Design an enzyme around this catalytic site. Structure first.
Site, PDB file in Angstrom:
ATOM      1  CB  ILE A   1     -11.783  53.852  -4.540  1.00  0.00           C
ATOM      2  CG1 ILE A   1     -11.655  53.079  -5.846  1.00  0.00           C
ATOM      3  CG2 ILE A   1     -12.469  53.380  -3.269  1.00  0.00           C
ATOM      4  CD1 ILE A   1     -10.595  52.006  -5.676  1.00  0.00           C
ATOM      5  N   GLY A   2     -11.629  56.536  -6.840  1.00  0.00           N
ATOM      6  CA  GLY A   2     -10.795  57.359  -7.621  1.00  0.00           C
ATOM      7  C   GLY A   2     -11.277  58.253  -8.550  1.00  0.00           C
ATOM      8  CB  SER A   3     -11.466  61.631  -9.113  1.00  0.00           C
ATOM      9  OG  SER A   3     -12.477  61.449  -8.149  1.00  0.00           O
ATOM     10  N   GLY A   4     -11.126  61.118 -12.229  1.00  0.00           N
ATOM     11  CA  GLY A   4     -10.012  61.673 -13.551  1.00  0.00           C
ATOM     12  C   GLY A   4     -10.613  62.654 -14.304  1.00  0.00           C
TER      13      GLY A   4
ATOM     14  N   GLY B   1     -11.737  58.969 -16.549  1.00  0.00           N
ATOM     15  CA  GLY B   1     -12.777  58.329 -15.860  1.00  0.00           C
ATOM     16  C   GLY B   1     -12.754  57.918 -14.380  1.00  0.00           C
ATOM     17  CG  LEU B   2     -15.701  58.626 -12.026  1.00  0.00           C
ATOM     18  CD1 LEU B   2     -17.258  58.944 -12.276  1.00  0.00           C
ATOM     19  CD2 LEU B   2     -15.264  59.400 -10.876  1.00  0.00           C
ATOM     20  CB  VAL B   3     -10.928  54.209 -10.036  1.00  0.00           C
ATOM     21  CG1 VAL B   3     -10.442  52.777  -9.567  1.00  0.00           C
ATOM     22  CG2 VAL B   3     -10.185  54.620 -11.069  1.00  0.00           C
TER      23      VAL B   3
ATOM     24  CE  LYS C   1      -8.216  53.377 -15.135  1.00  0.00           C
ATOM     25  NZ  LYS C   1      -6.989  53.572 -15.845  1.00  0.00           N
TER      26      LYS C   1
ATOM     27  CG  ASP D   1       0.420  60.746 -17.264  1.00  0.00           C
ATOM     28  OD1 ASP D   1       1.250  61.460 -16.723  1.00  0.00           O
ATOM     29  OD2 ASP D   1      -0.561  60.749 -17.091  1.00  0.00           O
TER      30      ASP D   1
HETATM   31  C1  B49 Z   1      -9.241  53.624   3.444  1.00  0.00           C
HETATM   32  C2  B49 Z   1      -7.677  53.927   2.830  1.00  0.00           C
HETATM   33  N1  B49 Z   1      -7.820  53.450   1.473  1.00  0.00           N
HETATM   34  C3  B49 Z   1      -6.767  52.333   1.155  1.00  0.00           C
HETATM   35  C4  B49 Z   1      -5.605  52.738   0.624  1.00  0.00           C
HETATM   36  C5  B49 Z   1      -7.584  54.365   0.457  1.00  0.00           C
HETATM   37  C6  B49 Z   1      -8.742  54.429  -0.606  1.00  0.00           C
HETATM   38  N2  B49 Z   1      -8.626  53.557  -1.718  1.00  0.00           N
HETATM   39  C7  B49 Z   1      -7.935  53.650  -2.797  1.00  0.00           C
HETATM   40  O1  B49 Z   1      -7.673  54.928  -2.906  1.00  0.00           O
HETATM   41  C8  B49 Z   1      -7.625  53.004  -3.853  1.00  0.00           C
HETATM   42  C9  B49 Z   1      -7.442  51.605  -3.637  1.00  0.00           C
HETATM   43  C10 B49 Z   1      -7.312  50.710  -2.484  1.00  0.00           C
HETATM   44  N3  B49 Z   1      -7.242  51.284  -4.892  1.00  0.00           N
HETATM   45  C11 B49 Z   1      -7.085  51.992  -5.889  1.00  0.00           C
HETATM   46  C12 B49 Z   1      -7.076  51.905  -7.430  1.00  0.00           C
HETATM   47  C13 B49 Z   1      -6.684  50.819  -7.938  1.00  0.00           C
HETATM   48  C14 B49 Z   1      -6.485  49.278  -7.540  1.00  0.00           C
HETATM   49  O2  B49 Z   1      -6.877  48.889  -6.490  1.00  0.00           O
HETATM   50  N4  B49 Z   1      -6.318  48.543  -8.590  1.00  0.00           N
HETATM   51  C15 B49 Z   1      -6.312  49.524  -9.564  1.00  0.00           C
HETATM   52  C16 B49 Z   1      -6.010  49.033 -11.080  1.00  0.00           C
HETATM   53  C17 B49 Z   1      -5.872  49.948 -12.179  1.00  0.00           C
HETATM   54  C18 B49 Z   1      -6.166  51.502 -11.739  1.00  0.00           C
HETATM   55  F1  B49 Z   1      -6.156  52.342 -12.656  1.00  0.00           F
HETATM   56  C19 B49 Z   1      -6.497  51.912 -10.490  1.00  0.00           C
HETATM   57  C20 B49 Z   1      -6.404  50.805  -9.403  1.00  0.00           C
HETATM   58  C21 B49 Z   1      -7.476  53.227  -5.297  1.00  0.00           C
HETATM   59  C22 B49 Z   1      -7.526  54.624  -5.865  1.00  0.00           C
END
Ligand code: B49
Length: 239
Positions: A15-18, A19-21, A35, A121
């Site tokens: 769901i995330g990029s940078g 490490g990775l999520v 993470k 940051d």
């Molecule tokens: C389909 C639409 N989606 C719902 C918003 C978008 C995809 N989802 C998303 O981007 C997304 C969601 C739903 N959570 C995160 C990230 C975190 C989270 O939940 N707790 C954390 C705690 C620490 C941290 F460093 C990141 C997170 C992302 C990138």
């Protein structure tokens, strides 16, 4: 904090990029954001966070150390990053809700300020949106840097305050990019000359006044988060 065994983690989707999520589950129960990854700096970061307890600061379930790459296990924030949420929900925000978001962040930041923790940051991308749009600061970029930071590397809670001003602009602009198409050198020279980000339509004169107070050239002229919090709250109460 608690040590988490890899077998206890289910990695569902990136769901995330940078490490990775990664979106996942712990103990087949709690929805979590995992993470993955310096290893010792990565763990210490988690150790610091696990001893800072505030409703507007993100929380961890624990650390998974046993297998490389090591990872941190965070609470799941349903609406993801603030930057992303602002852009996707653009057009649906009342000014009052946007101010509330700033207040949430300011609350978290005032707690960190008291704890002698500099974020370094602070930006919408490092904030998270959860249940009922509560905003939490996470992970506790010249466009967010104060003049004493981009020139002299002089960090303080007051430099975080500058960053917060830019965050306010991100919030009230509904996720626009600050100083878009401008180079780092162009940002530095413009700000040093006195240029400040324009007032977004949803930001009242009162809100913009506060942004500009966060953007005072001298750190000592900026309000501390503790006082900034009350200035933001006063505008909400005034109507
Ligand atoms: C389909 C639409 N989606 C719902 C918003 C978008 C995809 N989802 C998303 O981007 C997304 C969601 C739903 N959570 C995160 C990230 C975190 C989270 O939940 N707790 C954390 C705690 C620490 C941290 F460093 C990141 C997170 C992302 C990138």
């Amino acid at each position: 904090g608690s040590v988490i065994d890899p077998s206890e983690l289910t990695f569902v989707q990136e769901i995330g990029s940078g490490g990775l999520v990664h979106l996942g589950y712990w103990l087949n129960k709690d929805k979590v954001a995992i993470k993955t990854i310096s290893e010792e700096d990565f763990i210490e970061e988690a150790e610091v966070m696990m001893k800072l307890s505030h409703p507007k600061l993100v929380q961890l379930y624990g650390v998974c150390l046993e297998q490389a790459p090591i990872c941190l296990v965070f609470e799941f924030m349903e609406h993801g990053c603030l930057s992303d949420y602002l852009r996707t929900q653009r057009g649906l925000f009342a000014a009052e809700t946007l101010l509330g978001m700033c207040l949430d962040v300011c609350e978290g930041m005032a707690y960190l300020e008291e704890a002698s923790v500099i974020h370094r940051d602070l930006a919408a991308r490092n904030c998270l949106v959860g249940e009922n749009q509560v905003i939490k600061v996470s992970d506790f970029p010249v466009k967010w840097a104060s003049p004493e930071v981009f020139s002299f590397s002089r960090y303080s809670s007051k430099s975080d305050v500058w960053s917060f001003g830019v965050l306010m602009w991100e919030v009230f602009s509904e996720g626009k990019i600050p100083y878009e198409n401008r180079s780092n050198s162009e940002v530095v020279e413009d700000i040093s000359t006195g240029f400040r980000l324009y007032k977004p339509r949803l930001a009242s004169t009162h809100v913009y006044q506060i942004m500009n107070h966060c953007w005072k050239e001298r750190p000592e002229d900026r309000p501390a988060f503790s006082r900034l919090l009350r200035q933001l709250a006063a505008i909400a109460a005034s109507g």
